[PDB]
Amino acid sequence: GIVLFVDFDYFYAQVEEVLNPSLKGKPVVVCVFSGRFEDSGAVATANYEARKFGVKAGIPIVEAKKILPNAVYLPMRKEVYQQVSSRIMNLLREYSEKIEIASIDEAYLDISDKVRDYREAYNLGLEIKNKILEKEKITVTVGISKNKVFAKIAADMAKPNGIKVIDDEEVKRLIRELDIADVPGIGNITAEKLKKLGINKLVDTLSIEFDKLKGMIGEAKAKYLISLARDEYNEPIRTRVRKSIGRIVTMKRNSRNLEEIKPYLFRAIEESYYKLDKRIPKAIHVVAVTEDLDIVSRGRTFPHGISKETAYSESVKLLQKILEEDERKIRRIGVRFSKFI
DNA sequence: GTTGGATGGTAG
DNA sequence: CTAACGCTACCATCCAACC
Numbered sequence A: 001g002i003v004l005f006v007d008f009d010y011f012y013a014q015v016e017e018v019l020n021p022s023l024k025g026k027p028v029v030v031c032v033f034s035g036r037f038e039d040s041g042a043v044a045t046a047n048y049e050a051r052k053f054g055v056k057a058g059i060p061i062v063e064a065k066k067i068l069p070n071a072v073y074l075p076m077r078k079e080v081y082q083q084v085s086s087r088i089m090n091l092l093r094e095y096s097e098k099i100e101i102a103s104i105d106e107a108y109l110d111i112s113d114k115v116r117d118y119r120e121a122y123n124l125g126l127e128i129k130n131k132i133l134e135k136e137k138i139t140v141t142v143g144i145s146k147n148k149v150f151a152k153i154a155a156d157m158a159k160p161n162g163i164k165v166i167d168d169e170e171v172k173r174l175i176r177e178l179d180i181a182d183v184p185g186i187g188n189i190t191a192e193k194l195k196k197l198g199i200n201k202l203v204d205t206l207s208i209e210f211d212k213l214k215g216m217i218g219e220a221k222a223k224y225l226i227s228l229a230r231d232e233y234n235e236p237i238r239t240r241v242r243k244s245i246g247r248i249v250t251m252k253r254n255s256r257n258l259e260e261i262k263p264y265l266f267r268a269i270e271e272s273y274y275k276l277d278k279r280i281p282k283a284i285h286v287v288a289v290t291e292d293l294d295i296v297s298r299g300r301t302f303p304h305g306i307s308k309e310t311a312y313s314e315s316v317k318l319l320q321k322i323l324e325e326d327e328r329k330i331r332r333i334g335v336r337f338s339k340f341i
Numbered sequence B: 001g002t003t004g005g006a007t008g009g010t011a012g
Numbered sequence C: 001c002t003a004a005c006g007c008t009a010c011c012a013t014c015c016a017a018c019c
């Protein structure tokens, strides 16, 4: 059993360097503008040049301007990044039809039948990386291991433009010296809870009672960390199914006025009903970001699918609810559909 | 006891 | 307006309704 993992290098920023190569070698920052004021919004991603100076996903655009006033700031063009992603994902299918597309810029391939060993896997990694570069001009990191989770860790250790092959015998070694925070699924919260417990390496999970682990981080994730330490966690490659589709937009000013919020709500419904593309949901939720950036939601499950007309009607009702049940202003407003027929 | 539903969290 | 966009999977916690 051998899985190969691909993750595209500084993707949105790289696509922009492909479309305009006079950008190559200078810092590029791709931005989600929010129209609240001049350069309101956050950074989606930046190339490695920009990153060395602290510019990374999630910081405000104006924070990045204060560090790199002369970097190149381009608006995010999702549609274009998605066409490139699809072309590449189609490319990957020809190397294995057993492919799990995991996000806009990554995918897992089961290559068990395409190669006789890990050294041939490496060679296949080199070919995949070369062809992607030849056809779409985009560099990528490849991580090969015995299973998804280790294939992913392998890729993280190698980025950017790299390839790393942890084979079934080197995996044991990895478990011992992996930082617990470098485990996929362990963020700052979980990673910090675990320090309050002596667990710094992955392997340390095996030397602590199950209950104390389940107590701090819950059942699902405790079982996850333990089974991974024992090297008994071979989760299968499966085609991705969309379970929910939605859209959220940022208002030009905070408000609790229904008429002032509706235009944005309706824009989110229209856009997310288009993204639905013939799917028919039985669940709708209105999500609100509050002035203090907390997130509240209200929703309904119908026994039948929801028409665009029903969505318009019920979403106003759910927004009304939010406004009655919570006293703060709204800063962002959106909808999400789930439970497809 | 299940299990779906409403709502909120963590992560990538 | 004063810094913090958007997307979606999976999990947890409570609940009443169920077979």
Ligand SMILES: Nc1nc2c(ncn2[C@H]2C[C@H](O)[C@@H](COP(=O)(O)OP(=O)(O)OP(=O)(O)O)O2)c(=O)[nH]1
Residues within 6 Å of the ligand: A007, A008, A009, A010, A011, A012, A013, A032, A043, A044, A045, A046, A057, A058, A104, A105, A159, A160, C005, C006
């Ligand atoms: N708008 C937005 N897009 C994001 C955010 N995080 C990631 N993305 C998008 C933009 C990235 O180019 C793309 C892939 O994300 P990655 O996590 O793999 O990082 P990226 O490819 O940019 O750099 P890479 O070399 O891994 O480090 O996903 C975020 O917070 N906001």
Ligand SMILES: [Ca+2]
Residues within 6 Å of the ligand: A007, A008, A009, A010, A011, A105
């Ligand atoms: Ca990436």
Ligand SMILES: [Ca+2]
Residues within 6 Å of the ligand: A007, A008, A103, A105, A106
């Ligand atoms: Ca990625």
Ligand SMILES: [Ca+2]
Residues within 6 Å of the ligand: A180, A181, A182, A183, A184, A185, A186, A187
């Ligand atoms: Ca982590």
Ligand code: NA
Residues within 6 Å of the ligand: A169
């Ligand atoms: Na061997």
